[PDB]
Amino acid sequence: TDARLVAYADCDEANAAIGAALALGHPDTQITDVLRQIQNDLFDAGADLSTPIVENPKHPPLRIAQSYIDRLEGWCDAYNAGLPALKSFVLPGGSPLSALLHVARTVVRRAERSAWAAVDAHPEGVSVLPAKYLNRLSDLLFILSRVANPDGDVLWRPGG
Amino acid sequence: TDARLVAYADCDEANAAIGAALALGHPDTQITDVLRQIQNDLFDAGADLSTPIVENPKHPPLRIAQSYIDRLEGWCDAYNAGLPALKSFVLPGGSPLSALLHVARTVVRRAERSAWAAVDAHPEGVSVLPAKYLNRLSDLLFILSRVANPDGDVLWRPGG
Amino acid sequence: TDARLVAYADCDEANAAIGAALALGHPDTQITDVLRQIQNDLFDAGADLSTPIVENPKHPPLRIAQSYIDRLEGWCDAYNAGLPALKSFVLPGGSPLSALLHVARTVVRRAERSAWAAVDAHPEGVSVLPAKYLNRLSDLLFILSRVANPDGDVLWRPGG
């Protein structure tokens, strides 16, 4: 019901999709560490979205900070650097890992929408950072999906 | 936010669920080709839903056409022909492939709802064909799930 | 569109997520029987949510009864009894089975929200029992996820 409650739950659903990718996609050590850090960040995003903003909090805030987003942006550029240009649009799938990352990607985008909806409902009580974080995360998951498809992505083909 | 944006995103989520079925369900060659064609059609459905209808477009339209739907309807009848009558209601699951197709099936039905919602919000700017396509696709995925369960489906049992 | 239709469909999506857990998580005999019973209950929950309540029905009702909920509550206590105290918050994932149960858990919570929304839209024509059932089911799936992670859960870690 509550816009904050919905956004929080969607973050949890996106987080579980990353857990499935890690558990069923068998990523290498490097990718594993990146994904595990993201699971930790998504918990933070959920806590942030669920907690209304208060003036001069006396408790340690658990909020997504700009540095979280700067970090995803850095990983995006670092990982995308070693990839060839796309010849056609990518269809979701390929290796078990790429397929599972595409699933997480789409769930993350659904979570981004509710995070923005939370902001719309409480412009003064909800931070826009969780939404921006999820916005950058889906782009990173797209890149990682490509990284996880060594032999090329599944491509769309014009009807005729 | 936008009804078109939501419908588009749900199609992408359904498309990723089909990608997982293909990647983790190890379907045979025949089923693979059918599912790959559907992934291509779902991209088209997304492009259609996201693009508002314009009079006398000067660009090649990327729209779901009736022929897409006629094709799914044909596959439905062709595949359902070799199946026995249901003794009870089917519970989602069984083989890895059938279970993964049931997951995609339910996501497709969620996408169908937003496609219809897009039509409701813009009766003159959104085509009903994407929604009809998704409507027929969930029925086909139900049939394929049965096809992928050679030893029988998981059946519901009256409480007592 | 219809609040009952949406709630019904979400129950079906949650049911398919349990089917994936069973099909890809390879649970032992005990867990299998519990999950299979839940799939049967979720069918009932869907039928209940989809069928508006009528006075003096002449047909056998297919409704979630309090006994369904009492049963989940009993399993929750029985399974949680053999588990150690949590040292930190749990991140969704771990073993294939635990990861798949966390995915189902989050879908069940999404279904709970629409079941409550159905009640809100038709306070006199929709039972609150399906919603209560889903409320208890996500807590049980959390417990089972822990049970399925013999070597410990994936834990959240404070930023610094």
Task: Identify the notable features of this structure and list them briefly.
160 residues, homotrimer, Hypothetical Protein Ta1238, Chain: A, 66% helix, mainly alpha
What share of the residues of chain A lie within helices? 55-70%
CATH arch. level architecture of chain A = Up-down Bundle
Shape of chain A: elongated
Provide a count of the helices of chain A.
5
Total strands of chain A: the figure is 2
Roughly how many Å is the radius of gyration of chain A?
17 Å
What spatial order of strands do you see in the largest sheet of chain A?
1-2
Q: Within the CATH hierarchy, at the fold level, what is the topology of chain A?
A: Hypothetical Protein Ta1238, Chain: A
Report the CATH C-level class of chain A.
Mainly Alpha
Q: What percent strand of chain A? A: under 5%
Q: In the CATH hierarchy, what is the superfamily of chain A?
A: Cobalamin adenosyltransferase-like
Order of helices and strands of chain A: HHHEHHE
How many structural units, i.e. domains of chain A? 1
Structural class of chain A: mainly alpha
Please, what is the oligomeric state? homotrimer
Question: Biggest sheet of chain A: strands, sense, closure?
Answer: 2 strands, antiparallel
